[model samples]
Target chain A: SGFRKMAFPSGKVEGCMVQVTCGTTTLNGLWLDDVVYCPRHVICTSEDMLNPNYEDLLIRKSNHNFLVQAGNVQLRVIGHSMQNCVLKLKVDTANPKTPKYKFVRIQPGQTFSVLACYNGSPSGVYQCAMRPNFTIKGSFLNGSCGSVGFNIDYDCVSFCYMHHMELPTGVHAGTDLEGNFYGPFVDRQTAQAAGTDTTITVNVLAWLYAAVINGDRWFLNRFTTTLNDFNLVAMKYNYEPLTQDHVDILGPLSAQTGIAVLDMCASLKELLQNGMNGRTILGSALLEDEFTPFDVVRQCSG
Target chain B: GFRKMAFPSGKVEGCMVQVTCGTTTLNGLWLDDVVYCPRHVICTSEDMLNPNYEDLLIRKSNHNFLVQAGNVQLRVIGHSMQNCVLKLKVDTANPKTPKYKFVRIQPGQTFSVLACYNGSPSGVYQCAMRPNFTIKGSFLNGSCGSVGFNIDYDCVSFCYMHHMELPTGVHAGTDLEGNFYGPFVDRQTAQAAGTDTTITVNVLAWLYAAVINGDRWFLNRFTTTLNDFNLVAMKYNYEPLTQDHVDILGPLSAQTGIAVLDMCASLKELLQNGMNGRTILGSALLEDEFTPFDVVRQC
Candidate 1:
């Protein structure tokens, strides 16, 4: 709670939550284009940590969750050489504003801090126009070994593309927060009678499920946030169209809950008003212990 | 022609040579795979082998035999020449009527009784020329020929397969398919007497026939995966066609179809080329001509 207040002094885009589970505190980090600013790290350096003097900075066997939207991305490195390693990341060069390349240094024994945030646009709609290539190289810099580089071969690419599904025109669901149900409208005439300003949109979570099933690794990695955002909206409505088959298809990648549908008109209205950081209701939902979805949907409430 | 034939100048790969003497004296000479004599001789190709001589021999010798052998006609004995029957016909005293008879280039006779082992012809035989001796018979019976007689050819031995069903227009291989042909023969020229319909029909018929037989070599040059028949069918039509050009460039039509479907499989690769970082959204869209979208769409 104290870290969240201090993390974001100010930022154009919304911040992401960093749950340092091995420690007592959690952090809310701010994103300014490609730069990350948070509690312990003022303006997080987006450069390779050439040679760190602190051997205590390494992330050991501790759980760390970088929360964004409804997805919890846990980048865990566990192995003998992984104890002391540096991660090289080359990102979407197509976007001039996003960082072209960055590196993260891993120490040997302690929990390490790293930033995973979107740049350019808000998390809901941001896409990396070009796939980013990530290269992992492990090295040890010590008095006994000087500089020992391990011959490790690993390649990871991140791709992001958005598929938009537009709702049928002329059909109206709700005009206000009080009552909303995606119909069973009588006819086009009934839809027309609803009013001229009746335009409602909902994100489609199936696109991400389809990508995952198709084994599109690039799309799965880069579009996780957008996909999670859509999943969050669907869960709020208890969208009947989102079936058990869809849930099974998504499996561990999705977040689950026993929460029933609220008044969709009111829920969506309130959800949009708060933007990515949905008010107290969503804030509390995100803060729930089962918020992490790398472990699959956890039942939060009935 | 005699001085031109005095000495066999070119090289030969491998062939059987037959020589005949009449006033002209001859000498034996051998080079590479061919053997020649300074007299009337015919060379029949047997097998080909690499020769060290800078000059080509057997093909030239084959050409010479066709030209000089006169009545001694040359015919390809399907693939190889062994135990083959010959039917020869010669003019009777009355020039008006001729008689035909059968002869055989028997296995052993071909080498011992007819052509000499390597050099040329040697002597006349019991109704058969001795080894290396030039034949002195008629070709009608398919015998080694007789000297100085005319060889009139009506049709090749390998009869064309579908000639009976081949339409007259598609014969010259230049005929165009309907809509494509209409514009070429505009209403004006088509109705006029000046238009040589037969010639036009023959030309177009021949063009389409040529495309079918050799499309494998020509399709690479086309901008589209359309077969030769339809391409030519559409090419002459200056005006846009109302319907798809229906053409049967037999065998090649299916190839064009396969080529089209293969393009669909290549869409991913084509997009990869189009979506390079240097071009991406703005320049990729703005510099439209540089993109392969048109190529992909055509497929």
Candidate 2:
């Protein structure tokens, strides 16, 4: 009900045109590449968010299941359904046609709004999920860099979840604490923005359980990969191959649901710091150290 | 020849020193720092560290073999060289019958030690004096000589170079690896007979060996040449390896396997001379040129 109308569909690549609108409101064309991220779609009235109703559209969330609507050029958090930290609202407004980065403060289970700086309709807005930045102070010693930087977000655990589960969904699910179906994450950037990592980590544990449960090989690769994209797959392979013991560890959920996809692919990534830590290389081809490793794939191959 | 029994006249960072093997004394460098790593200090200047430590050293499996650093003939008692093993070299001249061996060094690093079972003695001999690596004056890539001595030049990326060790014999043609020996024998012979011998020879594994060993010197220099496919070398300012070469490098590496993997890893892990953002990737004996070659296939 909080959307009116705009223009353009979602998932447009780095250079597509965008527009958005809600009920009586309408925002014109802008670049879709201005912003497109996961767990959330970029439908700036791609087909249009018709007015569910004007009375109901009074900005339901600065930060949640609703939006701070300005004629369907709405702002919603459908990725990680909850936000317990600070937030960032980056909007693409066509009046000036620019991408702006904005930061907002938030509390757990709370909602608030900040007015748009744009004098006109906004083309898009998000928590800046696309790519976050970092620095490289070179050297294998105490120092080094050649114009090297990468993108990232703070909720590594959640990010791990999204990537593992196939982030295109724009949101993720998990078992909540005290053991119930937990927060279906609307957007983790907000989780990190609010500095709720310590609190929301349970969701990570929840997802991790699902991780061990869902355990697809590729998904498991995602399990060990960091937001920085570093992997420590040693968790599974380091100890031994994916064993029946893991099946026990995976326990009931997998046993009950019997979705064997995960069980078929329980994986563990490892790094044998000094060539298997001196483990004999005779029969095992799995042990490996960094070549720059500089980064191991040991398998329970048949 | 990365040493100076005589006095030094200049800085040790890149100074060529005298190292003798039987009748001839070759001039090699004692770098400011290792071309491969950052920790160990690699210089063979006149400034000698105390020889008092050698009294407890043990001779390795190649019984009677010795490692003479400065004036101390450390006839090492055992082969388990945990750390600071006689700086740079494994002298195999002790036996007229067999070859050479330098097992482990300082416990931690991923360098392979020399050891072979029905392996060739010429290989062991050649292996011992292997590859006095260096590539400084007038190349186009970054400097290269830390030395990558394949345990089996018979194999691919293997063995670390012992700088203090002296190379023996004069090679008439290509003899490092089988491929180098057979495929380019005539070119190697012509080069050897000619004054610019070392410079005219062109080989990828040879250069890649140099890449892994950090041997910046032993390349197709003294002459103008390029591996055509050696993109890693081309990208660096230090190879035959001129600027005008075609861009066959990326495609070559992708098409080929471990060779390019070693090349990229070497560049990435340049240890000491590390500004290129390249790291020389390699592994212990038998380890794939890349650890998880398939895993990193995309990582």
Candidate 3:
């Protein structure tokens, strides 16, 4: 099969900054199909299913890797321990009203603590984390070496198999750090639920702080080997499970601020639905049936 | 009368990205902040922002955009559409939040977009004019367009399109569809520190008021008296502006007097320093009551 190789996540690049550019990309700027931002060395298939749809289907299996995406902006991380076990992250909205997160310089423990992220725009990916976590002393799990553990069954999510690539570790994963997704002044649920501007501004700033404030020195992302440790599944922010936190980050990157992060991947049936920043651009001008183009735009006061 | 628009007609001639002001780099400074307007000469690194005494910096320096070499070009013809079109370009780029669309500082305010802009922005444009309102010309070309009109001050400023990329940032992306904005308003007019030069005229001081914007009882004698006003500027050693060409240069002397001899001093010196051998024109025109002088001379 013609499986395309993703260069970024597996390469020197960090999380969620990749695109599923097919040999058959479109115009009006639909060239980017979907993105991937997993937290492990990943593998799978990336090909146009040859259907009338606009985007390509990216099926990933964490044999030795994983995949993550804002859909528009793809990402992935190679963590310090197995299944990105080095560090874990989540947005801490404990006080919702006056919330906050932090930073600590420690001497490489097995993990770093972070908070949970609230996804709204769902169209994008809100990387509660930035760089990858490294392994301790350049080994997988201190004692379980790869050569001898030729075992029978394995928790594919955290453990690797024969032929599976090795996960990233130690300095290769970057530094050891952690922080919150938003400052104390964020509550998108309240903003979206109540629907107000001044509040929206608050939420926007919160998202900006989480997404922007990183430079405003910001970032986080990691996977889980053990349960209750951290859930990589909830990291995505899109449509059903999509959140505003994701929108704030992806919107600026892909220039899709007008649409929610979730709607960004609204579904193939309605690719360019709610606004201008849809995921699919019709490859063939003639196939208007399955393709979508730019129609909706951001309102002034909205 | 004149209307204007910018077109990313061509890539920057210099490897330059944004405006230069001198040794100073003014990237994020607000338009009104900089103390002096660096009227256009040629750019270095620090002084490209206020390319002209009346101009200001509008976008970031590193703001980059691509141009599809051939399909795009800089042309200006008008289609009889007026102020509405200019308005349309602005609204279309964003929505209702009308970002100031000028690096120019001309006076006289009467605002509107263009009619053809009916809510959509596409096609080869001609030029910008509001008939009697946005007032410029009527001809247009594909790559750009502009408009001018009355304002708070006895002024003249324009909003146009050009190689400067259109609102073409791939909303969800960006490419060469349009170029980039050269400058929002590279304009100049009525520096009314405080004056009523727009609506009043005392026959004895008409000409003097025309130059200083007539605030203090027409100082015809001021020209002859002591003056920080006598701009003893550098000249091109060889002359520059001819009646036929002038756009990008500054009105160094503003033809300050009937004997405004060798007034080409600023422009000629401007030509000598760098743009010594090149084809340039003011990026806009004047059409809304910026009277008592040949506004075209400044373009």
Candidate 4:
């Protein structure tokens, strides 16, 4: 209700970036308090939610065509994109004791391919490995009309939502671009048997790359998002899931070194829990608890 | 004694000078890097009657902190017709650390020395004359004036309710109960000063150190040096802080510095709004040896 109408950019401003949107509405390339919206769909709510919703709450799209919300909002300046990079979701169900769910990238000249867009419909299969074989069969927008580019119709989970979601159990989701589901990196039985893991071995670069693809500006900020991620992961497990490289990236941002990242993480966590409570977007996200992931098809469907 | 030394160009009022021989520049190039000469006309002497040469220099001074805006000034005045380069060598070492060094370059008949560090630890200050120059194309060596002084001021002191006078040099007043409270001058220091010892003195000491430390060596204290170095204790408080408040008070006199319920009435509000930890207490608590009590608690 404390929302102020910010002047939207009249025309396309070059190099404008965007925050990840929760609702299904595609108000792309617009400025909300100087923060540019990415020309992509970033789903934050359930697939059954309305087009202009944030988390589970509805966002009023003013007749003035401006976004109305709470807290401080801003438009980003630099563009964030993952236009041509392909993400490979690898699920290792072969090991019963140590099942792995990892997202990797396709190396150059690796003979990786996805079904081309045909008649505004995806020729490739978009399915998650489940007991009932969860799949998405629908017509979606093609970001790249016809070129060696990413399938714009295939909207990946936003990092904001992913930060809130429960871990998928042997639920490997990808396209049929592989033979018999890309030979099934890890079978369903092995993955499901292991259940949920105490800790997640995050591929830092891969996660950041996915953030770009998902247009999750909240996660891209690094400072707030990483603190939340570190604490959440820490809450779930005793061991830190980050690596030396993680320290290399996170340490310099915080003016720290070596194992000092642990202290920095603790310090920031204390900040969020106390002085910074409700002062940050992630902190606000934390207060609004219920964030269950539904079917992906309904995210952008009419 | 050498005879061709005068203050440098445009430096007639200052303490530094240029020593030369006719048109030849003997002391400038080499002595410039190695030594500094201060005017030595006013260096103090041990033997008042035989004080004809520059032998006792008090090259630096700072804040005594015993009175409001009080200064502990020191200067060394010398008289000479010698082609000699003088350095009013002064060294200030933390009483806890124990090391000293020269104050600065003074090239005249009087060396106006300095320091009352704005936020440095209390130290033992000393000044000596250093010789480092060549006269008549060769080096002549001898000692000038050398003097030393100690800087130890009690900015805060515990007092008894019935005491007639408070400690000298400390600004203090009676509390609501008509008892003496603090020797502090600033709001933050006053806010932190209390009869309670539960609160750490690190923050209190920092506030005291900040005000007491006037400047670094040579220019560290007041604008002008004092004519004498014989500092005398004008007032003293010998009241027992732990006895009367002990038996009926339950042996809590020693606890006063660590825990006093009645002080810093405004600070409690700041803490309530979430400004906690070292931010409220003071960064001096970071050290192991720092404490708020200027004197040991009684009982």
Q: lDDT of each model, Cα atoms only?
A: 0.20, 0.22, 0.20, 0.22
Instruction: Give the Å error, residue B103, model 3.
Output: 22
DockQ, per model, reads 0.00, 0.01, 0.01, 0.01
lDDT of 1 at A90: 16
lDDT of 2 by residue, B1-299 (tens): 01001111011111222333222222222222111210112222321233222333332133333223234343333232223322223332221111223222211112211111111000011111112221111111111112222222212332333222111112211111211211122111122222221110113333333333343532221221234324434454233422222232343344433334344344333322442322222122111111121111112
lDDT of 4 by residue, A215-257 (tens): 3333322343464576575555332355555455443323311
Estimate TM-scores for all models: 0.14, 0.19, 0.17, 0.17
Candidate 2 chain B — worst ten consecutive residues by lDDT sum? Answer: B1-10
Model with the higher TM-score, candidate 2 or 4: 2
Winner of 1 and 2 under lDDT? 2
Candidate 3 chain B lowest-lDDT run of ten: B8-17
Tell me what fraction of the real C-alpha contacts between chains A and B each candidate also makes: 0.00, 0.00, 0.00, 0.00
lDDT of 2 by residue, A114-226 (tens): 00112122111111111101101011100000000111122111111111011222222211111121234321223311111211111112223333332322223332333
**Recovered native contacts, candidate 3:** 0.00
Taking the tens digit of each residue's C-alpha lDDT, what string does model 1 give over A1-302?
10000000001121222221113223232222322222221111222122222233333322122221112543231221111121111111122223222222211110111111221111111111110011111110111011111110111111111110112331112100111111222111121222222111221232222222333222121112233454465455443133334334334343332111222223333434454342332212221111112111111110
Strongest candidate by TM-score = 2
**Fnat score for model 1:** 0.00
Candidate 4, superposed: residue stretches over 4 Å from native: A1-172, A175-194, A197-240, A251-263, A268-302, B1-299
